[model samples]
Each structure stands twice: as structure tokens, then as C-alpha cells.
Target chain A: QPFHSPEESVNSQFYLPPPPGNDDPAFRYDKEAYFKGYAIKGSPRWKQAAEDADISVENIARIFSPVVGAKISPKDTPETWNMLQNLLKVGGYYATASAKKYYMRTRPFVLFNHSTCRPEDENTLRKDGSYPSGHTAYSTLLALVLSQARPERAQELARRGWEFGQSRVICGAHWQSDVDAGRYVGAVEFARLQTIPAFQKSLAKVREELNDKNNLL
Target chain B: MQPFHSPEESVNSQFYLPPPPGNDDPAFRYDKEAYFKGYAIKGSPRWKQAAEDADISVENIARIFSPVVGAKISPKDTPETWNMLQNLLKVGGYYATASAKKYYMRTRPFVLFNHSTCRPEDENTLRKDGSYPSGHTAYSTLLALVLSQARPERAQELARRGWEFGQSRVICGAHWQSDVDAGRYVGAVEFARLQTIPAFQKSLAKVREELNDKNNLLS
Candidate 1:
């Protein structure tokens, strides 16, 4: 069975704040953030931003290794890895699609005619809406799922999730508002996912795998 | 001894947002503009909503959301519902937000501008309270989460009001728009934490059954 239908998705089920109007002070802030990101071209933050620009599900799981206290690999942690991949397929891209299509807020890089930290992503990102970032939503949902299995690392997991969202701003792919709204959207997705029996079963399997002493280091 | 973690174990250890944007930041400028927009509508029906949202009591809140629930959600008459909701508020509402408020220690919008809010009496006491994640928003969203679970038919409407309840804080001048936003995040996290607790789940199931009963409707 499918994880959920489009109508059952959080984007359809809940409301997201509208993208800031061009004249709105909030929009001004979104622009200011773009310039601020542009200023630190070669800094470590920029490097991290470049890394975060990769939207591959594997990259996301790998990036959380430090927070999860072990390498998250398909070979070593099959269940955990599969869960992330599955969530990225359903909850990540599918759940966030409606809002992105609805707003279609131009990305900062596209509006300013500037290149993002990841040149490869610029073309693809130009077509996608900037508000309520799908990347932020996806990463934050992964963080929350991992945290459930490893509550001891919840604080670190949450911190990483927060930074993962902010990385979009530093990457010049999204406004701060997009990142901010995305966090809550991710949480909303997590909350709804809890009600599904299949999702819960998958979560239980991930939890068991993560808890196994022989499985993860 | 506690239903959730201490502030240190909670958002104190994790991050919410970047300490509620400074005066020099563009986000802070947006906060100011949003505050003024709310301030301008002081006597309208929207203002009345801000007033009602300020009341964090379970009965008042439940009644306010009765239309969405298709039931009155009477805390006074229904002892089962009352105890469950009361426990939820104490554990998920006020108790869940203590750490983030203390950790952030961000000042309220009214105190910053030296302005009056919809509720005058709360100002004196709330002056000392932190404003990063609104307690009232947390309370309202937590209520919304459980109630939405109980009444899935009206989940969207219940959650929409929960979100609006946070927006009322912005209009009331008691919180910045970002503060209310973070409060929603705080409420979401606290609600996630609540899911792991067997006791909270038991109480939630009991209330769900009570809420679904024909006799419980309209009361």
C-alpha cells in the first residue's frame, strides 16, 4: 500500500503561511538573507551549504551520522537506511509537492540571476518553488524519525535537523521564511505518519535495528 | 516525577530558531511590521479573538473549539473528559514550554515597545516571562493535537484553529509572529514526545471514546 495519498498529505491537510509579498518586510528579510549568504562565498558555512544542496536521500542519511552516533549505510543499517529512503519518497517529495506548486515562489538565486553554491542544482531548483522548502521538510522529518529510536541523541538530532533547514538559506536556495515554515511542515508530516499502521511498523523495525548492538556502531 | 524532560533535556538542549532575531536583523524588522499590523486592529472582531486566545483555561479553550468538534467539550460536567484534558494541559502545555522560555529569555513585543496588549492584567506578570515560544500557543496546539486525533473527521479544522490560536498571539501583541511560529514547533515536538508515554496515550484513548459517544455531544 502507498504511504498516503496526495489529499491525505500534510500540505493538503494543513495551511502554510503565504510567501512574503515583494513589498512586505518579510520579503525584504528574505532578500537580505540572500545577500548575506552570497557574502560568505568560500566560508565553511558555504561549503556546508554546497553539501546540503545535494538532495539525494543517501546524502541526507549520511549527513546525520555524527548526530546518530554511527554511520547510516544501506550495508550496515539496512532497515534504518530503507526507512529514510521510503520516507524521502513518500513524506519528503510527495507530501511537500502541493504547497510548492501552489506558491511557486521564485528562488533567491533565480530572482537575483545568481548561481547557488551547487551549480548543478540551479537548473532543477529554478523550476521548484522556494517557499516551504522540500529539502528542509525532508531532513527535519528524517531527524525526527531517527530521534524516536535514539532518544538519547534527540537533542543532537534536533540540532542537526535545525541546521539542515537553515542550510537552505546559506545555499541561497530558499528564504528564511521557507526554511522556518518547512520545519513545522516536517513536524506535521511526522505527526500524521504516526497514525498509519504501516508507517508505525516500519518505524518499529528501524527502532529495533538501531537498538541492536551488533547492527550499528 | 515529570511527564517530559527538563528544559535542559528538551529544547534547551535542542535549538528552536536563532534566539529570536536581533534588532539589526531583517527578520526582526519583519517582526516589527507584523506587530504593527496587529496593533492597528485593536478594537475589531480579530482583536476579540486575541482576547479569547489569551485565556488558556481548558474549559474556555474547549468551548471555543466546540464548533469544530461538534461537541461542547464540557470540562465541568464531564469528569472523564475534564481529568484527561486537565492532565494534557499540565503535561503538554505549560510544563512542556518551561525550558525554551527560560533558555531563550526573549522579551515580549509589548514590553519591548512599552505597549498594552488585549489583556492588561497579564502584562505585569508576563513582563518577566520569556517570549520565544508562547506558552498559550503551546497549550492551544497541544489541545488541538489530541482533539484532532480524537475527531479525525474534523482534523483539518481543529488543526487550523490550533494554528490560528498561535496567530492570535501575534495580533494580541503578546508575541512576535516568529515567537508564535516557534510555539507551533514547540507544541509539535512536545506532542511527539507525548506519543511515547503510555499514560498520556491511555488518557488520550479514554477522551477519544468519551468524545465519540452520542451522549457527550452538545455537552
Candidate 2:
């Protein structure tokens, strides 16, 4: 809760933009329409669930390993590791909380009978809002930090970052619109972090370490 | 709008997937694919009008909204109004959407359908940009919202202009039905947030006053 919840965050450093409907009818209507179409697309991806949808450090390492062109782990690359951990879990993570609390829209699995990566947990998943995606936020932050550190793999990192967020879609953990907005969560955080001299300095050191490690590939 | 809000950037971070490939959901893809196909149906007033809307200069907006306001409006003829509008669009228009666009990088409808569109002028730039929330639509919707405040009597016409401006993207085959739909939401976010930005409101006031002068467009 470092940042105020969405409603209270208004005019605060962690202002989470309001979700896009209320004032416009067509916007509201198409959202439901798009969600219906999207749920059907995600139904096929449940088979890949076991590890892909699991939100664990090892899986994070696995996704980053290919982009890094080498091994990446908390023990080996502590700074980069720590940065991802905090941003993913803390460092204004509550922005999503207040947002979700406000919208409280039902997830696809509940509304459309779509299965998620964690099938057994479907009952709980159905109750949460689908607007702001917490997973997509960190995945995007991971994308930016990784690409910037390894400029050589920037485009690939960007693409993989996209795929990672979309995996939320593939796993039926979120809708396309939620992933769309959540991507900016990382952008906003990264933009804010860049302004701090400490972040830039740590980021520079991480870039150097990543480059050194990447060269081994 | 402010710093973090944009339709593409979804407040509350609401995300929706782009349409499935044509193979999976031809119904979802139908409008865009067919909309592009119709551009080849030949020359018509819509072709010219839709392309003009895509360009989105201040002149385009003032003119599109003139009939509703009961006067001929043109930025070229209204210099002060032009300056103020530049402030409004420059301040509240594109930053958040651009960031979100970079994040999504969805392909343009023409690129997906492999067809040429009405706005050849915007082809290359449009290709690399994300298609979920049409930038042109946001600008049009914002402009329409501002004008509607000044001339409430013409709200329906102003609204139609805003809606039409977005549909122009579809007609041109540069955007999808979903993109146009979301663009309105993005525009709604921007327009709502614009009311909070002092600079934007001030610019809006100045433009409103200028329009009240009742002598624009050389009419």
C-alpha cells in the first residue's frame, strides 16, 4: 500500500487513471463485446497451464533467461533480481489493488466458463476484477528493464514482454484490455524511477553486469 | 490527459486482447477486413471526407463542428482560436496513448488485411503504431467535447461529428471497429482529464470566448 489505492491516489504520485467507461456508452458496450470474443480465444490455452501461469521466481527466471541469452537468477544477478522482485510485488503494487476494488468486474472464467491456468482456483479467480492486471504490470516492467540493460536484445525483449503479458490472456488470467492498461503501470513506474538518481545508478550497474554475463553467450 | 491516462493505457488498467486471428474469429475480423475491401469500391464523397478527418489539423476539426455551432469555423481564419487549440491538443492529446501504443504495438488493419487504405498519407506512420485506440479519434472526440461545451444547442451534431470522425478511421481501413470503439473511451478519458488540467481548461475558455466573438471563417 505504498501508493494510495486508486480513488485516494487521485492527485497523488501514484495516480492510477480511471478505467474508460462511465461517460461513454459505446465504450462500455464494446468492452463487454470484446471481452466475450477474447474469452473464447483463451479457452484453448488452458493446456499449457502448469508452469506458464504460475507466478514464481523460477518462472520469472525462465522467461528472462532466453532474453538474457544466458542464465538469470536472484543468486547470480542479485541487483536485477531484487529490482524485479520489488517492482513486481511492492513499489506501488497497491495501485492495482484500489483499481481492482473499484471496478470489481468479474473475470472471464466466472462469466463465460473459461478455464484459467490454475483450474482448481477458478472459483476464487471469478470474483476479482478483470480491469487492471497485476501480472501484466510486472511483466512489462521486466520487459523494459531487461531490454534497456541489454540494448542488444531490446526488440526481442519488447516482443517477449508483449508475449508475457499476453500469456495472461493465453492463461485466461486477464482480458486483453486489462493487459493493455497494465502495461502502462510499468511504464508509469519506470518513468518515475528514471527520475530518481539512485534508480538510474543501480540500473547502470545492472546493465553492465548483464552485458558482462550476456557476452558469455 | 494529465500523465498516466489514455484509452490505450486503460485507467484501472483494464486490458482487452486484440481480435483473434481471422482464422479463429472471422466475425471479429469481418468489419475491418470488409471495411478495407470497400475502399476499392471506388471514389465517393466519403473517401475524401474520411481521409480529411484522418489528417486532423485544427482546421479540420473547426470545420467539422461549424454547422453545429451555427457558424463557419476554420482555424486558418481564427488565429487566436488556433493558438488556443494547439495548446489543448498539444497538452492533452497523445502522450499516454503513445506509451501504450509502444507497449502493445498492434498492427494496423491495412497491414493485417494486406490492403491499401484511404489515407495513404498516413500509411507508414500508421503501420508501426498500435491500432487499439485510434489517436485521430481521440483528438476528434476531445475537440467535439470542447465545442459541445461552448455550444450545447448543437450537442447532437457535435457528437455525431465526433463519432463520424472515428468511423472515418474504419472507412479508411487504417483502424478496426474495436480500435474506433476503444478510441472513444480513450477520448473520454482525455476529455474528462482535460477538464482538470488548468492549462487545458484555460485554452478551452479562450477558444470558447473567441467563438463567442461570432465572427469566424470569413463569414
Candidate 3:
């Protein structure tokens, strides 16, 4: 129970630059993000992303995993899927802990007292920090881990990573900066992962599994 | 506590939340129904209470934090080295949390949720910035942290005022509870770092010596 809360040590080595203050670029982009859900505030998209956020750490690719311009089913590369899901499960949260400690920003819903899904968990939500969202960090980092094979799919992979991060915003679970900070953490963890020999070997296996599946395709 | 080589390294990474579904992400998003209900309650509080919180200029800040007799601060009352602490805070307060506020880019509850805040004049600028961490809370907390040393006997009161100061944000519906919580932590840590600065240490020494005299308020 000593460590009941989650955290990452991202504050020391490299920190994401804090969000913009009083600047037009910051205002422009943040407003755009709010308006993103403004039109679809209560629609099915909000419901879907809200649901997408609740899965196991490894299931990110199950939703969308396309390699080399070819989208494949979760069953197509089952081993590859499991490998990524396993490796990135904890790595996702590990990356954002430090930033959370440094900033401790409040969550959007908490700040506004806005209605979000899952009413049962509000008591627990009241206690957690909101900046550099944990969910975005978890899935975006997973996205990086899953996309390591298709250097070709890197752009799409990263795009999907942003969407996953943005999904939290769409459902009013996070602010744009929280997602941005989370995405940066994901990239940092991806870099951190590459240094490990074991992780490298794991990546090779995933590559092999994906290549075999691609050949079948 | 053994020193964490760096803060980021200090956290237990094992703790992570699955992003909530719909509005249920892993991060703690606020509950809207309760927030609006709370907003309605605060909408009718005494204007004096709200105004007292809204005043953030250096003068009012000095009075609220240093209500003690021995080491009161200035804009209204200067006590030599005491003024240095006030000036140090004026700059540090903003610089410390500025980057984070800009980045978080959260909308104010009042702006988005239709509630009245402490200072209506500041809304234009407040709306532009994120509301993740409240700057007012940080500044008030920083004042309490620094001035508490100047008047150690009243440290409890100073600390209490610091906590209450942040609550004003919540009362005015300007910031979330988490933002205020983070502001206090940020203030405490920044105060620790500031003490290590030799210039501030000398200032602390001089101020401590000054407070040691029976001349300052409450001394």
C-alpha cells in the first residue's frame, strides 16, 4: 500500500514543455479540440471513445491494427497482438507518472463538474490527478509498441495513437494538453524501451509474427 | 525518504488506470451533476468573500499572508528585508506555474458551465489558459510558505490561510479541487528549492534576525 497511486519520473530527464499560456496557437488548438466534441457532445462517437478507453492495456490494436496499408483483424496476427499487449501494459502508465507528479493538474470533468459516463466511479475520480492523462499514455505507448514493425505504417500508427489520446478529450475525460503530455510520455517510453536488449528481441518476434501473417494475406 | 534521482523516477509505475469508457477514462474526470449543484450553492455566497479571493496584486497578497505583527509585508507596510520576500514571490509565483497552466489549457468551470467566478474582469484571460492547476492557489500557497518562516509562531495560521486561499478558487468555481491540491504541493516544493538559493537564505537570515526582534507584528 506504500504506492497506492500511479506515477512516472518523467520530470527529470526530459519534460514535456508546459502548455501554452495566452498564446494564439495554444488558444486556437485547444478551442478546436473542445469544438471537436461540441458538435458530437452526446452522440455515438462520444459513447464509442468512452468505451474504447476502458479496455485492457493490450487491446488497443484489436480496435485498429493496419500494417503496410492493409488493415488486419485481431485474429490475423494473434501472437503479434499478444506480444505488444504484454510489453506495453505497464510501460504505458510508467511513462506518465513523473509528469503527473510534477504538474498534478486537475481533470476537466472534475474542474467543471461535467457529466461523463460511468457514474459509479466518480468517488474515486475525485481523488485522481488529471493532467498528462494515464489512459492516453497507456494506449499511445502501446500504439508505438504495436507499430514498431511496419516502419511504413508509422505515420498511421502515430495518427491512431493521437486518436486514442484524443478519444479521452472527445468523451470529456481529459484536456488537450493532458493528451499532448500523455503522447509525449508515450514517445519517451518508446525511446526508453528501445535501449533494452530483451525489448529488442521482443520486437523482432513481433516483426516475424507480423511478416508471417502478411505473407498469408 | 531516499532521494529520487529525479522526480519522474520516483513514482510507482505499477499504478495505471485504464482509460474510462464514454466519460469513464482512467484519469479522474469530474462529475457534472455534482459540479452544477455545487455551483448553484456557491452562486449566492457573500460577495465580500468572493472579492477577497479575487484580489491578487502584491499588496493584498502581503497583508493576507503576513497578518502577524512581527513580520508583516509591504505594498502597504515594508519591513526592510521583508520586502525582498514579497518581491521574490511576485516574480516566482507566476514563473513557477505559468508553463503548466498554459499547457493544460483547460476551460474555466464558470466559462464552460455557467457559473460566476471571483473576478469577472479576469475572465477574458482566464478563459484563454488551461485550468488544470490554479495559479492563484500556487501564489497564495507560495506566500504562505515563504512568510511562514518569517513568522514561524503563526505558521499554522499561515498554512491554513494558504489552504483556504486555494479553496476560494473552488468556492468561486474557478478551479477544481485537484488543481488546488497540486498547487499546494507545487508551492511547498518550490519553497524548499527557494531556500537552497543562497541569496534567499541570506534574506531569510536577515528576516529571521529581524523577526527575532520584538518590533515586528505578533513577535
Candidate 4:
């Protein structure tokens, strides 16, 4: 049977708002700054959380470390990474578009008056209200899925998800609520991934390799 | 020096739920029977909404509708209408994608379920979480844009936007909220039409000629 009939899917209450008036806020709170501050100062809770997850700070740094003045690894084919990355990216697009249509939440920029929040260039003309952050959700979900694939560094992957959410807030494109909602949705996506037979097979392969004595299984 | 970015951009929080549980009362409440009885039947709100937008009525049954079949015009020209029809179809697709993405209030069918919502023959297995309008938005959007361009009937053009949205709900995959949000986003895409400045300029010549002669223009 069809998932949704045409009649049941109509969006009758769609509304477009006029341009923002002069009184809108100018300097908005930046989420990136907050994220940077967290990275530099290291919140006790964040550190504790990392420790709890058994993720070493050195391992986190190593994952994010950029290679300096060195040739690309000859053996690093990147095929697996590329495949996972593409899947996550496309998955994010589909999931984001789908969620935006499904939820139809009012964007924070639209919700708050000009005095409360500054509008960004792209969102300035956009009428689709943002409730859950599509970008954040997609990115976080991808991060989570990737982490699950590399379970040894799952904590660092989770940290990446948190950072992704912070990026949206910093850009003034979405609210905290949007980030929160996105994270929840990302978790849901991860859970949904467990049901896929292909994903399960991949997981088993990765697990077997990790558990092998030669680490080449 | 920086491109656009948002704190909410990277954070993932949108959750997808599997299909609704069979035994859930709320799921049954919004089932096909309830939807058909209350919203799909003739003379219902949805029907009236569509009819009103399309300017169709019992009295105007004989009127020549551009998209619909009628006896007034030549039947052979339907092939020409295909190009316009396809373009307008994109509007339908945009409407479908946009509608489901914005309407955050209604819960999807899969969210109510405790287990996997997967079933055989479901191409949209990954899309269980997004229960708004379907890809019809792209199709209908294309149709509306093409129809407006080919016919240039201002009266029906405004209604085409509404018709596209209405079709979303009439099909039953999306909620009204989905249609509403998609309509606005898809409509905005019309502005992107500026990118095709060359074709637009060329089309204008034909349009002006058509408009110059009162007899040639469809009244």
C-alpha cells in the first residue's frame, strides 16, 4: 500500500511572512564561539562525559589532526571512508527534507522579533519555517552512523555530532530548540539504521576485523 | 571571508520513527477509513478546497479547463500540453518535499511504532520518518510552472499553486501542514527562474506577440 495518499498530504496552512522590519536584532548569539570556548576551556561535564565514554583526549586530537607538509598516505585508499561519507551526506539530504516537510515548525528567526535575533542572508527570503535543524540533524546523524562503524572512537564521533549542532547556532540560522530536535532526530536515524540488513552485515564485518588477532580480518 | 554557518546546522536532532503500531488508537483514528470518511468524500472540506481553487463547479462543468479534458478545444493539441504539463509537474514535486519538511506539528505514522516499520515493496524504506507529502511536489510544481508559462492564464495561475498543494493532501501521504510549507518554498523557486534569462527573454517575445492581439489571447 502507498505510504501517504495525495489527499492526506496537502499543506493547507502554508504562510509567507513579509520582509523583516527595521527593528530586528543586529548582533546575534554565536554558537561557534560557544563551541570554541568549550573546546579551549573544556567544560567539566564535557570532560567527565568523555572520560566516562573511555575516549582519550589524545585519540580525539589524533582523529582531528591535520597532516602537515606530508604526502597523502600511499596505502590510504579512502574507498571505505568515501563510501560512508557519501551515504551519510545523501542520507542527510533525504532525511532533512523529509523532516522539514513532516514537522513544519516555525523557524526561530521567524518566531523571534527583529530585536531578538538577526537574520542571515539565505534565510532572509526563505519562508519555510525551521523548527528542527535539518543541517544539524543530517550532520549529526551522519556522524553518529560513522561512529557506529568505528566503534573504537564512538565518543569522538559523538563529540563531532555536538560540534555540528553548535555550528548551526553560531550561524544564527537555527535556535537551541532546533539543535535539540536535530540531535533527537539523529538518534532516531541511528536506531533506524539497526534495522537495515546491509548495515548489519557491514557492522558484523567491521566487528570481526576488530576482534581478529592479526587486526587484518 | 567566511561562508554561511549555523550552530543548529551541524547538530543532529531530527528523529525518524518507524510506522505506527497496528494497535495504536491514534493510528487507527487517522486511518484510511477515517481520512476518507471525513476528508476524502465528495463535498468534504478537502474536495471543496480543491474545487474552489480550480474554479470548477457544477455550473461550470462545460468550461474548458487547460489541464483537464474538455470538449471545447481540439483534442490533438494535448501533445503540446505535455511540455507545459511536465514543467508544472516539478512544482508538484517541490510542494511535496517542502510541505513535509515544514509541518512539524503532526506526528508521522512510523513514530508510534515500537518495532521496525519496514514492509516488502516499500521503495521509501529510509523515508519512514518523513510522512509528509511525496515527491509529487516536484511533479506538480513542474506542471504548475509549465502550465502558467504555456497558457499564461492569470486567473488560473494563482489557482495552480493552490491546486498543487491540495493534491498533496488529496493523495493522503502528507498532512495539511506539509502542503502548506512546501507551497511557500516551491513558489519561491520561481524566482530562481531568473537563472534562465536567455530563455525567458526569448519567451517574452512570443508572449508579447500573443498578448498584443486581443483575438489571439485566451479570454
Candidate 5:
């Protein structure tokens, strides 16, 4: 079965590289290189950059509900909301764990002997699972769906997505590479959303409503 | 009109602080400076201190449960048990919030700032309403009720209560101080259980059947 919808056929199964493997040719499981290049660069302390991106995405999500006064659509029926939340939580757990196992990449805190570039005392200093940042995946997917529905605030929505990814780095939970990879996977999944009949139908309905001249102010 | 309950009263109200400010201070505000100066001292994290104090009181309350168990009294009817739990929760909430407001003290983070001490990042900092530990009150009260009913292998119940209070502190933007105070107050009230005949009778009966009985294993 497909990773997404039930009716869709599984086209391909893309597996992430296992941990402790020389997955990246240049890095070659080199802890020092990975730490220096990705983890430190994308760390949450670089908030300014992340905030710049998040502003756009958050605005987009907000515009749909507040500014435009568009009625927000529930992802599932009221009865199903709790179940959907549980399902999403479970999916996130499995996806994150699977990504970590596959990547087996050493986290920056573990690789670096002591705090080097950033103030050591200030860091959360997490030392494991530096792959496919879970926060990025969840936040980006949420942003993508919200942005698609509220295109007028697309820039704001995208910016919020950027901040969501940045938070992982800020929390010192995941490396920058993990976030980057997670975002890529999330984007792919979001695009794949359009291919599903249910998603397509929902999108079409939303678009039709937006296009209706009578609905315009 | 009385703060303390009479011997015949069904509920104990003795420990309840007299309606704030004793009708003297305008707006009935408790004197923060007086309360803190009288009670609080420089400490190793107010939450930890509160937890330690609460644990001590909770242990005392647990001791009271022993006598109820020794008598082998069966639990009161389901309605009575439910009512007891509801009353305990209601009292717990009021006590916790009231204690915080009465003390009206600054949190550890704020104290640190006032003292010009080194502090963590801004995100980790907590709000000023940290006096009269809340986590201690909420968790201890909940645990007191849960333990009275599910005393066999009660570690899980206790741990869950601790976690719940921890989460409350995290969400409340208060330092661990509020959490700890709440927990201790709960334990104190629970230990003073015998003062309230109706609550004591119902809780004791429930404890004998469900909490202390050997055959009443959770599994």
C-alpha cells in the first residue's frame, strides 16, 4: 500500500541510509565533518534566519482564518478529530524513529568533544538521532496544507514553516541536515497529496469557492 | 463564618487561610514581602524544595491510610467514592490557586534576575507567580485520592501524578515552586482527613476494599 492514501498504488519505496553508515560520500560517517557542516550551521541559535522564513508561513495560515475570514476546514469530522490527532502522533513517532534508525548519523553534541563555536553552557546538548528532523516534517506538512488552502498568505505560511524547522535546531534536538532532509520529504509528500482523489477533490472544492465572484467582497 | 470545621461538620476547613487579607488590606491582597520574608529563603530550586516537603507530608497521609486498611473496611458505594474524588479535586484547585495568590511571590527565575545571578536562555525562564508551590498541591492531592483507592503497587499512580504536576508547571509558565506548594498543601489536607467525618468515612471504606485488599490486584 502507498504511504499516503489507501487507494493509491505504492510506486516506490525510498529508504533512508542506516545509521553508522558512510551515507554521504564527502562526510563518510565522519562525525566531525557532519557536526561542523550541518548541525552547527542549522542550530536554533540562528533564530533570525528561521524567523524571517516563519513570518510568511504564519501570516498565510492566519490570513485564511482571520484576515480573509474564510471558514477554516477541519481535516477530519469532529468525531474523527481525536482519532486523527492520535493517528498523526503515531505516524510522527514511527516516521521519526525510522528516519533515525536509517540515518544512524551522530548528533553534533555527541561528535563535538565540547561546546566549540556556540556558547557550550547555553546549549541543550542533545547527543543522538541527527536525521530527518521530526519537527520540520510535521511543521512543514502543516504549513503546506494551510498554504495550499490559503494561497493569498502563501509567503507567510512558508515563513512559519521555516521557523518550525529552525525550532528543532534551537532546541538542540536535531542537526540542520536532518531538518533539510525532513523538509524535502515533507514537500514530496505534500505534492503527492494532489495525486490522491480525496485530497484533489477537497482542493478543487476550496479553489471553486475562492473563484466564485459572488463570494468575493 | 468559621474557617476551621466543627467536630460534627462533614468537611474540614480548619487549615484554609482566612479569606485573603482578613478584610484589612485593600483589595484583600496578602502581603507578599511579609509572606516571603517569613517563609521563603534562598534555596536550591524552589520546586525541588517543595517536592521534598510535599513528599514528607504525603508519606504522613499514607500512614493514616494504614489504620483504615488495618480495620479492613470495604469501600463506600461508587457514588460516595466519586463524590469524594470530586470534592478533593475541587478543594485542591482552590487551595493551589489561593496559595499562589496569597503569597504573591516572584518565581526563582525572577529572583535570579533580582539577585543579578546567571540565568538560562530567555525561553527557559519562568513567570513571576511562583510562590506557595502549586505542583506539590495538585499532584499530592490527586495522588492522595488515587492512592487511597489504588494502594497496591502504587508507584505508577504516584509517578503519573508527579508527571501531571510537572506538565502543569511547564504549561503555567511558573517555576517548579508553584507545583511543589500545591502538592504539599494537598498532602496536608489529606492527612488532616480524619477531621472531616463524611469524607474520612467514605475514603476509608474505599481504601479497605480496593487499596489494601490482597486479592484486589490491578492485573
Candidate 6:
């Protein structure tokens, strides 16, 4: 069975603030952040934003490669690779889907009619809800799962996970609140995953694979 | 036996971040700005009352979640659910922050500014405790997390209330914004750890059953 059933989705299992209204202080913060996000448009952080926009499992694993001290993939790390694949296959994306549809909030770039760092992805993105970032939910959950396997690198993994979420803000693809809610969703998803025996078994295998001194760099 | 033998035993043991920023650090500036904002709102009747209400007891603090849960929650009205909640808070909430507070020993914004909190009557006792992670915020967030598990339909509403509960501390000048922020993470970590415990899971199952029974009776 999946980590959470339809009734147990993060969308339904935990709460997130609705998209801030026009006059709310939170909307002002989001707007202010949007403008500030542009100030760093040409900087290295913006470049990182472009890189962080990739949602492929490989790209996600690559982002954490340095922290993990090994390239996480199907070939060299089958156990770890399979675990990620299983999570994705089961219900990884389901965590934020309903909330996204329920709110259907507009993305910052679309709202401002400005270009994001990743122009290629924008057209496809315009149709979907942007309240809780799917990219952030997955990335944040990745960091948490990876951290469980490698506690010594927890600080770096967390910083990277946080930046992954913030990248959505910098890209103007999501509001700061969306990214914030994404973290909450990601955390909740990880918590829910812990309750499943299959997930725990996968986690155990991952712990052994990553913690092996010979397996790691 | 203790729920967690040491802070590092739980699934979320690796999830916590570093200590709160030091007073001399630039990051501490955000806390300073938030403290002033809290100071500015001191006399406002609504916020002061909210913060005071947040200060009372965990049992009292839970009512903030009632509207979202679509049912009143109290020890008397929801005994089994209430008992489960108390255990979750005791193991997950308090145990998580206790160590962090000891390690960080960060000062409260009120003490640093020589300002007073909404509840000055208890200031003498609260004065000595480290304020890196607001205990109340952790409890509020933890309650929100577990309750969300039981009542997923009201997840977002419960979550918003949980976030607002933490903001009350900032509004009341009882904690730095960073402290309240960190408390949410601490709460999430603890809640995740609770998921790994068989007894906790059993209690949570009972909570869901109890709520369903209550709703059934009402209908």
C-alpha cells in the first residue's frame, strides 16, 4: 500500500495557510520578496535557482551528492535508488496535489508577468496551482530521508533542502508562503512515510548503504 | 522508561538544525525587528488577550484548534483523545525542546530589551529559562500535527491555527521570531519521531476512533 491513502494525503492530513489576500501583510511580504528576488536575478544564487528548478530524481540526487559523499543512483546505490523510486511511484507527488488544486493560487512570475530563471518550464507551469511547491515538497522530503541515513551530514543536508525550497521563491515560480507551506507538507509527508512498514524497510537498507565507510567517499 | 532514551534516539534525531543565531550575528537583527513589532503591539486588546490565552495551559491552548477540528476539545469532552494528546505532548513536544533549550540558552527578547511580556506575573520564573525554542509554540504545532493525522480533512485549518499560535508569542513579546520559527521545526521533528513509536501510534489510532465515535453519537 502507499504511504498515505487518498484520505491520508498531506493535502488532507496537515494544514497550510491559504494564499494571502491582496491587503494582507503576508501578501506584501510576498510582493516584497518577489522584487528582492529579482535584484539577485543575474547573480550566482539565480544560477543556483536555475539548477534547483530541475525536478528529475537524478537532478535531485545530484543536488545532494556532495552532502551524501556518494552519487545516489540505481547502479551504484540500488537500495537507495529503489527507495526513492518506490516513494515516487507510491504517492510522493500526491502529497501536494490536492492542496495545489484546492487553492489554485497563481505563481509569482505569472502574477507579475515577468520571466523566471527557467523560461523553458514556464509555459507548462502556468496551468497548475502554485500554492504549495511540488518541487519543494519532494526536495525537502529527500533531505529529511537522506539525513536519517547520514546523521553527521544533517546540517548540510538541511541547509541544502531549505535552499531548494527558497529557489522556488527566487525563481518567481512560487510565493514565499508556498515554499513555507511546502516545507510543512514535506515534513508531514516524511512523518507519514515513517508509519509504513515498507518505507521503514527501505529506510533501513538506505541506512546500511550510506553508512558503510567503504560505500561512501 | 523514557519515551526517548536520549535526544538522538528518534527518527527525527538528525532533523534538527543548528542553534539560534547569536546576539552579535547579523541574523539576530530579524529577531530584534520582530521584538520591536511585538513591543509596538503590547497594548492592543486582541493580540494581548490571544497571547495571554496562549500562556494558560496546554489544555486551554488546544481550544484554538477546536474551530478547525470542527469540534470542541477538552479533557472532559474528549477524554481518550485528550489523554492521547497529553502523551504526545509529553513525549514529543517537551522532550524535544528541553535539550535544545539547555544547549542554546538563548535569552528571551523581553529580557534583552528590559521589556515585559503580557504575563508579567510569571516573568520571574520564565526569566531564567532559555528561550531558543518557545515551548508553547512546539506544543501548539505538535498538537496540530497529530490532530491533522486524525482529522486530515481539517489539516490546513488546523495548521493555520498552529502557525498563529506561535505568532502569538512574538506578538506578546515572550519570544524572538526566530525562537518561534525554530519551535515549529522542533514540533515537526518531534511529531515525526512519535510516528516511530508503537505505543504512540496505538494512542493515535484510538484518538481517531474516539473522534469518529463522538461524531457518530452527535449525528
The model with the greatest lDDT is: 1
TM-score of each: 0.92, 0.51, 0.43, 0.30, 0.31, 0.74
Looking at model 5, residue B82 earns an lDDT score of 38
True contacts kept of each: 0.27, 0.00, 0.00, 0.00, 0.00, 0.15
Model 6 over residues A1-217: C-alpha lDDT tens digits? 4555665554533366577788655566678778878889989999999999987778766877788777677777788877665565333468888888888899889988999999999998899888777787777777777777776676567667777888889888888777767777777677567656677888888888887776777
Top DockQ: which candidate number?
A: 1
Candidate 6 CAPRI assessment class? acceptable
Q: Which ranges of candidate 6 are over 4 A from the true structure?
A: A1-7, A12-14, A85-92, A212-214, B1-3, B7-53, B56-118, B125-133, B146-161, B176-178, B190-219
lDDT of 4 by residue, A11-105 (tens): 21221112122231111222322343334334554443333222233332233222111111212323333334443443343334444555565
RMSD of each: 2.5, 12.1, 16.0, 18.3, 25.4, 5.0
Per-residue lDDT tens digits for candidate 5, residues A1-217, read 2234322211111333232334432133234333333454545554443332232323323333443334333431221122223223422334455455554566555565433333442243254356766556555555555444444544455555555565555444455446645554344334344334555455555555543454433
- Taken over the whole model, the C-alpha lDDT of each candidate is 0.76, 0.58, 0.54, 0.36, 0.39, 0.71
The candidate 1 chain A region of ten consecutive residues with least summed lDDT is A8-17
**Residue B21, candidate 6: how far off, in angstroms?**
9.3
Residue pairs whose backbone atoms clash in candidate 6: A15-B155, A15-B156, A16-B156
- DockQ of predicted model 5: 0.01
Q: lDDT by residue for model 3 over B69-105, one digit each (tens)?
A: 2455553344654465454454345555555555556
Mind sharing the TM-score for model 2? 0.51
After aligning candidate 3 to the native by TM-score, how far in Å is the CA of B217 from where it should be?
Answer: 1.6
Please report, as a residue range, the 10-residue window in candidate 4 chain B with the lowest summed lDDT. Answer: B1-10
lDDT of 2 by residue, B76-125 (tens): 55555666555446533564355455556667778976878887777887
Cα displacement (angstroms), candidate 5, residue A107, comes to 4.0
Candidate 4 runs further than 4 Å off: A1-77, A89-91, A106-129, A201-217, B1-219
DockQ of 3: 0.02
Q: What is the TM-score ranking, best to worst?
A: 1, 6, 2, 3, 5, 4
